[PDB]
């Protein structure tokens, strides 16, 4: 069926249709190279700024039940984990972080386990106002990561603490990784400033979200579309489709998404290793 599935939970609240979920999900990953001869062993963490709520209006006024995607949040943290860079995750509420678990891949041997291993982290993170008062010239992060998913549109793109983040990061010379909707977060630099300016970045194009309701992933149409923004903000997108290829650009490092996941994780295992 193409009919969006209700979720009982929310009110007027709708899952992907079973087609769709059987057209870009599935019960295990492609989790590729995670071998990692020469591992890093400083004290640097990967920071994760994820979704705090599930639900995204549409523009028929129904909810579509989503979050952040398992495996485009997963994958590439296996990677780093693997690679030797531990991980804190932050949200902006403090709240627990929402996956879209209809994307989780059960009965996957590895990734499955790394998540309820690692889980109480993405259930109890920090708050990001908190953690971005720490930050200064030596806070040791490295990397800040958003990962995709639809979640990723729904508050981060207004967050003025994102914006400091994303801002202590690219000014520290520290790396930023991204793919589906993450960028979207990328938006919250509006206010003046935005050194990410004239970098280049790979992103889900709204060409496609603009139709895939049209066989019941979402319930209705987006509000707004986050690519077309993006380009007046001052960046650069590279695709119109999804190929699952990335792109670095110096040190800013995407993904289209989740079918990049595994790719991505590898270019920031490599660019991060390579440079520590």
Same mark, same amino acid.
């Given at each position: 069926s ?5 979720d009982?939970?929310?009110d007027?609240?709708?899952?992907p249709?079973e ?6 999900t ?5 989790l590729?190279? =995670?071998?990692?001869p020469?591992?890093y062993?400083? !004290?640097?963490?990967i920071? @994760? /700024?994820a979704? #705090?709520?599930?639900?995204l209006?549409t ?5 579509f ?16 984990h693997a ?6 995750v932050?949200?902006?509420s403090?709240?627990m ?5 209809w994307?989780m891949?059960?009965k ?7 998540f ?6 993405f259930?109890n993170?920090?708050k990001?106002?908190?953690v971005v ?6 806070s040791?992060y ?6 995709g998913g639809?979640g ?5 793109p207004?967050?003025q603490? =994102? ?7 690219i !000014?520290?010379?520290?790396? @930023? /990784?991204?793919l #589906? ?8 630099l509006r206010h003046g400033?935005?050194?990410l ?6 992103a889900?194009?709204?060409?496609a979200d603009?139709?895939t ?6 319930p209705?149409?987006?509000?707004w579309?986050?690519?077309?923004e993006?380009?007046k ?5 590279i ?7 990335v792109?670095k650009?110096?040190?800013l490092?995407?993904?289209?998404s989740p079918?990049?996941?595994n790719a991505?994780g590898?270019?920031?295992?490599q660019?991060?290793l390579?440079?520590?």
């Open positions: 193409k009919n969006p599935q209700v009982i939970a929310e007027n609240a709708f899952f249709s087609y769709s979920l059987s057209q870009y599935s019960p295990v990953s492609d590729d190279g =995670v071998d990692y020469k591992p062993r400083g !004290k640097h963490k920071l @994760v /700024i979704a #705090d709520e599930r639900y209006p523009d028929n006024g129904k909810l039940s989503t979050g952040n995607h398992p495996i485009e949040t997963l994958l590439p943290l296996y990677h780093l690679a030797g860079f531990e991980f804190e932050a949200t902006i403090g709240l972080t929402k996956f879209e678990y994307a891949p059960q996957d041997e590895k990734v499955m386990p790394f309820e291993q690692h889980k109480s982290l259930r993170p920090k990001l106002a908190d008062a720490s930050l200064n010239a030596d040791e490295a990397a800040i990561f958003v990962p639809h990723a549109l729904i508050g981060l207004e967050s603490d =994102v914006a400091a983040a994303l801002q202590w990061a !000014k520290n010379d520290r790396f @930023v /990784i991204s #589906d909707h993450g960028p979207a977060a990328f938006l919250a400033d935005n050194p300016n004239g970098y280049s970045i790979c889900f194009p709204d060409a603009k139709q309701p049209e066989i019941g992933y979402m209705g149409h987006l509000t579309y986050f690519g077309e993006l380009k903000m001052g960046m650069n997108i695709n119109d489709d999804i190929t699952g290829r792109h650009d110096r040190k490092l995407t993904g289209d079918f990049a996941a991505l590898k270019l920031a295992a660019e991060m390579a440079a520590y």
